[PDB]
Amino acid sequence: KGIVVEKVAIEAKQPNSAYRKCVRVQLIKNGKKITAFVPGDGCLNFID
Amino acid sequence: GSLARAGKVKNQTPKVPKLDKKKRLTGRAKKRQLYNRRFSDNG
Amino acid sequence: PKSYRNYSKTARNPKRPFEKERLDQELKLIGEYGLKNKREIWRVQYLLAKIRSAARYLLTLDEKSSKRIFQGEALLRRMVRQGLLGENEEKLDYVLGLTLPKLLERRLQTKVFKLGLAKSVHHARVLIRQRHIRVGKQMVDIPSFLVRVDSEKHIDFATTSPFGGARPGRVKRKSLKKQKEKTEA
Amino acid sequence: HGASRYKKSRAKMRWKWKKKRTRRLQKKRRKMRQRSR
RNA sequence: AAAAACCGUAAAUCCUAUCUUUUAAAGGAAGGAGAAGUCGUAACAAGGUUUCCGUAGGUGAACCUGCGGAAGGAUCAU
RNA sequence: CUUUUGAUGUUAGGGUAUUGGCCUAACAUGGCUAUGACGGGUAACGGGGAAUUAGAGUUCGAUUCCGGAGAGGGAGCCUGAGAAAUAGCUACCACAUCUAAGGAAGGCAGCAGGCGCGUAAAUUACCCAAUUCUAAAGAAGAGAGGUAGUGACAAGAAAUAACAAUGCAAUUGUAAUUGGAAUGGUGGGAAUUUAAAACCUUCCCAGAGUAACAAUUGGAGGGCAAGUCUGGUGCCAGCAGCCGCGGUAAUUCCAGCUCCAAUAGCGUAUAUUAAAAUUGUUGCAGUUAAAACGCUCGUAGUUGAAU
Ligand SMILES: [Mg+2]
Ligand SMILES: [Mg+2]
Ligand SMILES: [Mg+2]
Ligand SMILES: [Mg+2]
Ligand SMILES: [Mg+2]
Ligand SMILES: [Mg+2]
Ligand SMILES: [Mg+2]
Ligand SMILES: [Mg+2]
Ligand SMILES: [Mg+2]
Ligand SMILES: [Mg+2]
Ligand SMILES: [Mg+2]
Ligand SMILES: [Mg+2]
Ligand SMILES: [Mg+2]
Ligand SMILES: [Mg+2]
Ligand SMILES: [Mg+2]
Ligand SMILES: [Mg+2]
Ligand SMILES: [Mg+2]
Ligand SMILES: [Mg+2]
Ligand SMILES: [Mg+2]
């Protein structure tokens, strides 16, 4: 479990072309920061 | 950047309601129907 | 503490989920004996595999050995009592020739269908589930009941069933009611 | 990376010159670590 | 009975000495990924000076030159 | 490595329930080790056992039984046949309660229950009727133990129709229409069960037709069973474990229809076993794919003609 810190977009690898939607999270357990993918067509605007 | 395009096509597609009832068989009767359709009428 | 009663499984999965020939053969068998899932086929396969494993292990063992004599006589008696071997093939080598249709022929459903007494195998399954069938003065309502040799001549309708000499059901009595008040007024 | 060093089937930079570059770098590192001791 | 002394069994606190784990930082210097960047053309053909090994010097860069070795050579041969 | 401060032995005593460097005095220089001592790590309590495997193996075991250890952390002690006991006592370290401020009381890793921690776990219920234990031993007591409540951890059985007639492509079959039987699920009342608690079983009454008493979760290019069907989007939005799809013809995105798989169950994440003869004793490879030490001698080890 973690608290959302930022929303970002990531490039795809070379032969493909798209902008993938992710969030940056700070973990409650130990305070570390990770990056996580948000699956779904428009699921990013479910997140504040 | 441009992350305001999220959920474009999902909001673009026009909505359509589904069909009415067409209830289906469940369990042993369904297997009976499959057996009859796949084997009985073929010879 | 934890309870001392135990439990075990009865089936197994095919390890290869989309093989065409196995799937067609299973549908053959299901439609022939009127079953519900692949689980019934798999449980019969499990039982047969255990039997065959015991037979193989005994057959490797020395002829005229004590363990062979005791366990082989026990297993052959069990098989002949179940109705799977016969009379002239009790030799511990005819056990390895037992197929799936052999065992799957002893279910109460197949027996009730084959002994007249029901128009179809599906009709047979429906009647068993509605408390219409006895096996020797004991009423049974489970279609996977496997019938033994000395019990196949006592299959019959139940004494508490409208098909075996009792009062009629909830529909006949209501029709007779309504007819009575129609004809008395 | 033993005898398979200097193996050339792909058009890379020559092995002994890369060896020389690494040795120069290591000499610099050793001098700068000694200066703090 | 209270109370003292001594040899023992000894919680605890402090001062030093090592050790293990985690961690801050001016500055220095590697690797991986990306973008249409600037400079040359070292390798692949005898790649236009055949390539490569150990060692030692030098130069913006890839690299060049001396000494000894190999063919995985461009020679199975006078 | 151990040995000034007991490390290895001998002599004499002390002490204990008894043997003993267990302790004290005198004496001697011993003891262990590449067949791994002395150290470090363990997200290590040990077994009986568990999972998966043709045979070998690999990985788990806090947790029903047995053995060990502990009661916030250490040390000391009384009673007693049995304790270094903690719902016994005495101090120190930490934490914390009541107060008239002089003082007095504390230990849920026992059963329930609360906070915190986190991905992660139930009722502040009834009873001594059964199994057993203690006593001044029928008769008292027991959160030992049993009974129920919550509970898709795991395991077993098993509904969601069946039949006939008439039509209809081929005796079938059923995208259909008719019409009567058979049944539980459900509501009420009993016989029972039980410390006249509730399940389960068995009877009586009522009670199915869109039997609305209406099955889901994932998929349809290949691996891998199943659509060259319609509408929208246009390297965007998105999908995809892997190869890949997406610029007007998208079998892969978003929807509708239809099909496929398993089915009261079905997906996702992490770990582990087979697959792996990709750890090889059975049973791998070493010219060029990863890999014969530059060469010889040599101790330990492994292996050695016939009678
Ligand atoms: Mg090689
Ligand atoms: Mg050249
Ligand atoms: Mg002494
Ligand atoms: Mg254990
Ligand atoms: Mg125990
Ligand atoms: Mg505690
Ligand atoms: Mg104590
Ligand atoms: Mg205490
Ligand atoms: Mg307590
Ligand atoms: Mg508790
Ligand atoms: Mg749970
Ligand atoms: Mg009692
Ligand atoms: Mg008395
Ligand atoms: Mg689709
Ligand atoms: Mg494995
Ligand atoms: Mg293996
Ligand atoms: Mg194998
Ligand atoms: Mg190999
Ligand atoms: Mg050599």
Curated annotation (Swiss-Prot), chain B:
Q: Residues annotated as region Disordered? A: 1-43
Give GO terms: molecular function aspect only.
structural constituent of ribosome
- Give the subcellular location: Cytoplasm
Q: Which UniProt keywords apply?
A: Cytoplasm, Ribonucleoprotein, Ribosomal protein
**In which domain of life is the source organism classified?**
Eukaryota
Cellular component GO terms, alphabetically? Answer: cytosolic small ribosomal subunit
Basic residues composition-biased segments: 20-35
Query: Where is it mostly found?
Result: cytoplasm
Q: Which GO terms describe its biological process?
A: translation
Q: Which family does it belong to?
A: Belongs to the eukaryotic ribosomal protein eS30 family.
Q: Outline the subunit composition.
A: Component of the small ribosomal subunit. Mature ribosomes consist of a small (40S) and a large (60S) subunit. The 40S subunit contains about 32 different proteins and 1 molecule of RNA (18S). The 60S subunit contains about 42 different proteins and 3 molecules of RNA (28S, 5.8S and 5S).
- Chain's role: Component of the ribosome, a large ribonucleoprotein complex responsible for the synthesis of proteins in the cell. The small ribosomal subunit (SSU) binds messenger RNAs (mRNAs) and translates the encoded message by selecting cognate aminoacyl-transfer RNA (tRNA) molecules. The large subunit (LSU) contains the ribosomal catalytic site termed the peptidyl transferase center (PTC), which catalyzes the formation of peptide bonds, thereby polymerizing the amino acids delivered by tRNAs into a polypeptide chain.
What is this protein's name?
Small ribosomal subunit protein eS30
Recorded source organism is: Plasmodium falciparum (isolate 3D7)
Q: Which residues of the full protein are shown?
A: 6 to 48 of 58
